[PDB]
Design a protein around this nucleic acid. Structure first.
Ligand SMILES: OC[C@H]1O[C@@](CO)(O[C@H]2O[C@H](CO)[C@@H](O)[C@H](O)[C@H]2O)[C@@H](O)[C@@H]1O
Ligand SMILES: [Mg+2]
Length: 580
DNA sequence: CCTGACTCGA
DNA sequence: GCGAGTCAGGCT
């Protein structure tokens, strides 16, 4: 059942038509400075397989790659583009990306290879990558005969599937979402990843020594208070020491034993001095393992830069994710871990780190979408939304709002977003269900429009089978009809949450696209480095700071127009840490 | 070599 | 709500 194709030893004219399905294979998961093991091209003239050494050394092929008028259809073009950037080659003209097309059609499928996407249209004349390359220790590039056939079949699938995918996207009203948002964004993410972020490894290594010391003191202390020695990182050994040897009370049980989660230990703290030391130990240990040692492992020794990979087709809400390393979860909440950020510095001398973040974008989106008069007015007055919520649900004046009141109103606001739950709120505020449900009820009394939205969005999810975001991203919720209370409730929360988190993601993605267009028009040297859900991190010459102070916020605030204003705060400094 | 338990972020 | 990386423990 083999597929016909030419295993070319040299590049020819017909291989350079103005439309083709292109495959530039990089098997290494992390594609940075990784090898391109083969190339496949399928067009009106036929199917071809080219050896990378050959094709990439050919002036005509490289020019075709960089010709914006020569259209290419691909799967995960960002992977190819970055792999090519490292080789000094530019990839242009990608008009269709099957990975992004599949992702928008149904994020739930978890499409990560051509075979998975093809299966959505009953196309199975191609094998899953894992079948061909294997995985883990067994992972490996097969011989040319098998490799060449696999790449050709993938190119063939892409070539065949483009039309049906575009047609459905069109029916879904997601055609612009792919062509004007996700695809252009893919090119921006590639530039960001390729650029990387400079790390002050000596700073990290010094912080590492200090931690190793402190971690050592707290460690001995723990063995001293426990009366012996054990693996504190062993939740199994810890549970025995705490609940058996020290007789501490059991407030929460896990699935395999006792629960030693911070939320539990926080309640045990009063009973024994070892609990605080275990918590502190848990802190320092997290910083050392993940952010010191874990980070140092992925810094490029030659450039001292870390090159993350943004997974643009994974989250169910439209958000990006980041790996190797994850630069979207760098410490900031606790001062000790926040210092980790001093290690992220500008990649050039006399340059600075500029960070801009949307203020309460999710709640503002909710105000717009629900059209709640009270909430819209609150933002129109640019009020401290948490103080305002407390004033309403506790019926008091601004002056009568105590810190504890605001803290709880804040927790209610956070819950309303993730999809309110009396039980979930109860655990968060450490109170009973009735009490939590009382707050929620009081909240809905103050924000009737929000309540109406929650009810209406759940109904719509059941009527249509999915919910959507501002820019037409969708999420199917089959569980919404489940007769199992728990399963159904999770789906209902997703129905409430996705349009909020999802619309917030659409907005920042568009802002990134708009911002890049503005930076180019202005010929500014400033460029994007990272995106952290609701914030943008850039680096630029110190001479560009003043222009950025006006430009970045404006572009971000004007990305979309809502019934309430969009607000962006910004800071800049010598290091990421100082950009506060 | 996979899963549970933990903690980091928005 | 949505994510990723570490460790320990069981696989084997
Ligand atoms: O660029 C990432 C891109 O590739 C996919 C596979 O289609 O993920 C691969 O690469 C990631 C980064 O190296 C890994 O985290 C992941 O495990 C690997 O399969 C897509 O998820 C993504 O869009
Ligand atoms: Mg913010």
């Amino acid at each position: 059942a083999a597929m016909a194709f030419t295993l070319a030893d040299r590049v020819t004219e017909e291989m350079l038509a103005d439309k083709a399905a292109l495959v530039v294979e990089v098997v290494e998961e992390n594609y940075h400075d990784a090898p391109i093991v083969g190339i496949a091209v399928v067009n009106e003239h036929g199917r071809f397989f080219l050896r990378p050494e050959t094709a990439l050394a050919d002036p005509q092929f490289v020019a075709w790659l960089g010709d914006e008028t020569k259209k290419k259809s691909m799967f995960d073009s960002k992977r190819a583009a970055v792999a090519l950037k490292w080789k000094g080659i530019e990839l242009c003209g990608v008009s269709f990306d099957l990975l992004l097309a599949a992702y928008l059609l149904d994020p739930a499928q978890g499409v990560d290879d051509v075979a998975a996407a093809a299966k959505m249209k009953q196309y199975e004349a191609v094998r899953p990558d894992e079948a061909v390359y294997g995985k883990g220790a067994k992972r490996a590039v097969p011989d040319e005969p098998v490799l060449a056939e696999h790449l050709v079949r993938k190119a063939a699938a892409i070539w065949e599937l483009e039309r049906p995918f575009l047609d459905e996207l069109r029916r879904n009203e997601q055609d612009r979402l792919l062509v004007e948002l996700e695809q252009p964004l893919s090119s921006i993410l590639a530039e960001m990843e390729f650029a990387g972020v400079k790390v002050d490894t000596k700073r990290l290594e010094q912080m590492g020594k200090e931690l190793a010391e402190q971690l050592g003191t707290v460690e001995q202390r723990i063995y001293e208070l426990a009366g012996q020695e054990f693996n504190i990182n062993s939740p199994k050994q810890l549970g025995v020491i705490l609940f058996e040897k020290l007789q501490l009370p059991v407030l929460k049980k896990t699935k395999t034993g006792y629960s030693t989660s911070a939320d539990v230990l926080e309640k045990l703290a009063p009973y024994h001095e070892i609990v605080e030391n275990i918590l502190h130990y848990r802190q320092l240990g997290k910083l050392q393992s993940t952010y010191i040692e874990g980070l140092l492992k992925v810094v490029r020794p030659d450039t001292k830069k870390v090159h993350t990979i943004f997974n643009q087709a994974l989250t169910q809400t439209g958000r990006l994710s980041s790996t190797e390393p994850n630069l979207q979860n760098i410490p900031i909440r606790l001062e000790e871990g926040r210092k980790i950020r001093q290690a992220f510095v500008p990649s050039e001398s006399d340059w600075l780190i500029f960070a801009a973040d949307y203020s309460q974008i999710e709640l503002r989106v909710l105000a717009h979408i629900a059209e709640d008069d009270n909430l819209m007015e609150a933002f129109r007055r640019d009020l401290d939304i948490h103080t305002k919520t407390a004033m309403d649900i506790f019926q008091v004046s601004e002056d009568e709002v105590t810190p504890n009141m605001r803290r709880q109103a804040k927790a209610v606001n956070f819950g309303i977003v993730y999809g309110i739950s009396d039980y979930g709120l109860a655990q968060n505020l450490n109170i009973s269900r009735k009490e939590a449900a009382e707050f929620i009820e009081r909240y809905f009394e103050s924000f009737p429009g929000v309540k109406r939205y929650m009810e209406n969005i759940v109904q719509e999810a059941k009527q249509k089978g999915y919910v959507t975001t501002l820019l037409h991203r969708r999420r199917y919720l089959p569980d919404i009809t489940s007769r199992n209370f728990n399963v159904r409730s999770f789906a209902e929360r997703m129905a409430m949450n996705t349009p909020i988190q999802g619309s917030a993601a659409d907005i920042i993605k568009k802002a990134m696209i708009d911002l890049n267009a503005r930076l180019k028009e202005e010929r500014l040297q400033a460029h994007l480095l990272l995106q952290v859900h609701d914030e943008l991190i850039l680096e630029a010459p110190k001479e560009e700071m003043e222009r950025l102070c006006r430009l970045v916020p404006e572009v971000m605030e004007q990305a979309v127009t809502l019934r309430v204003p969009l607000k962006v705060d910004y800071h800049y400094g010598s290091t990421w840490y100082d950009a506060k």
